[PDB]
């Protein structure tokens, strides 16, 4: 085959990851995979120093930006957090932050007419298709590590299939009978 | 793997501690732990000889210096102090000094746009997350001695996790079907 | 029948028809799958080919 080089500007290489603590290790592996492949992944564990200054400001920095692609790491505990992190648990701080992020994503999704432009749900090894929040089921749900190539393609904003250019309508020959 | 020694200048090794009496028993052990690890911890009990000359000047020296990291020892009596030392606690001098320090911290925190650069809340054994003053809940909260290594890392201004360097965007190969 | 469908779409595109199929419209389809389907279901002028 032939080699194609992406023109993705560095401004469009930002990525933000939201997850639950049950999938922390696989999230670290996923972050390594994204970083080595050139994507600037913003995650709490790695930006701990900056995140400590003002946690809410740090989250809002990525939630405001329309050009940042948010990756949602789906796991059994993610749905649990975004549903009852405050009541079903003994006030888990990370769960509450994840719930806040999910609410902001939902608000943005609704205000846009229920169109998902930059939220990418990813299923992790112990996750099931039932764990995806309903509004996120209306888009491409990737699985990790199964579809990591597809995740890279999506982040690169490239088509997995190159449709050849549309040709001209065929010319018709007329024969008598 | 390979060992690492922080190149932290002795200027950045200054640490100031504010606490309440109930937690003083463990604060002594905490100060010993920090001194063993090479930090210049300034606390009233050990700085007594210099502090005796002028208590207010002694406090102001650490409050003015932006480079001095302040550790807040959170305990049930700490919130009670910083909320009602003057009236509810029969005019406790140490409580009053703690309240004054807290007010100075809040004033600086507000002046900076509600961004916390050098105030480190630490939860001591008899404390709970509810005891942390609200503005201090917006940053990392460390439990002692549960997260002592994390406290050391923070004082060293080092990241517990170091992300791999960002690579170049992957090249895409085109294969006809 | 995915592979033969890809060949069929090649055949249609080469001959000048704008074929909307999920695998090629992945970028737009990802925004809202149901809206993407309804766009072609509503339009009375879009011919639907059913690959049996």
């Amino acid at each position: 085959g032939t080699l194609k080089t992406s023109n993705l500007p560095e401004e469009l290489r930002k990525v933000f990851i939201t997850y639950s603590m049950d999938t922390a290790m696989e999230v670290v592996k996923f972050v390594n995979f994204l970083l080595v492949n050139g994507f600037q992944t913003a995650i709490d564990i790695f930006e701990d120093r900056i995140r400590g200054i003002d946690i809410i400001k740090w989250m809002e920095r990525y939630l405001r930006d329309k050009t940042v692609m948010i990756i949602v790491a789906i796991s059994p505990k993610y749905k649990q957090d975004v549903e009852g992190a405050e009541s079903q648990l003994d006030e888990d701080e990370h769960g509450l932050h994840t719930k806040y992020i999910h609410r902001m994503m939902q608000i943005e999704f609704i205000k846009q007419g229920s169109m998902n432009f930059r939220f990418i749900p990813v299923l992790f090894p112990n996750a099931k298709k039932e764990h995806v929040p309903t509004w996120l089921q209306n888009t491409h749900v990737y699985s990790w590590p199964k579809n990591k190539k597809n995740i890279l393609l999506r982040l690169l904003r490239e088509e997995e299939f190159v449709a050849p250019p549309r040709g001209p309508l065929p010319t018709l020959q007329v024969v008598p009978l | 793997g390979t060992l690492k020694t922080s190149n932290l200048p002795e200027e950045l090794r200054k640490v100031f501690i504010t606490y309440s009496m109930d937690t003083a028993m463990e604060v002594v052990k905490f100060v010993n732990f920090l001194l063993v690890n090479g930090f210049q911890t300034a606390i009233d009990i050990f700085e007594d000889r210099i502090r005796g000359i002028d208590i207010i000047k002694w406090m102001e020296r650490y409050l003015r210096d932006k480079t001095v990291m302040i550790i807040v020892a959170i305990s049930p009596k700490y919130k009670q102090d910083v909320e009602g030392a003057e009236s509810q606690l029969d005019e406790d001098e140490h409580g009053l000094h703690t309240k004054y320090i807290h007010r100075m911290m809040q004033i600086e925190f507000i002046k900076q746009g509600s961004m916390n650069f050098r105030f480190i809340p630490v939860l001591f054994p008899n404390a709970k997350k509810e005891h942390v003053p609200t503005w201090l809940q917006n940053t990392h909260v460390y439990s002692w001695p549960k997260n002592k290594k994390n406290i050391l890392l923070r004082l060293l201004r080092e990241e517990e996790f170091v992300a791999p360097p960002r690579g170049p965007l992957p090249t895409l190969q085109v294969v006809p079907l | 029948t995915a592979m033969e469908v890809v060949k069929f779409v090649n055949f249609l595109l080469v001959n000048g028809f704008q074929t909307a199929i999920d695998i090629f419209e992945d970028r737009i389809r990802g925004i809202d799958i149901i809206k993407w389907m309804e766009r072609y279901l509503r339009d009375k002028t879009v011919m639907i080919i059913v690959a049996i």
């Binding site: - | 006809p176 | 090649n10 001959n15 090629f24």
Partner: peptide
């Protein structure tokens, strides 16, 4: 018109992963 203009699938050729480290004091 002949179907020579085939559809092509795009894949990322070179990739790498790992290299995460954690400080243990």
């Amino acid at each position: 018109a002949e179907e020579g203009a085939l559809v092509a699938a795009v894949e990322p050729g070179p990739l790498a992963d790992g290299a995460a480290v954690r400080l243990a004091l």
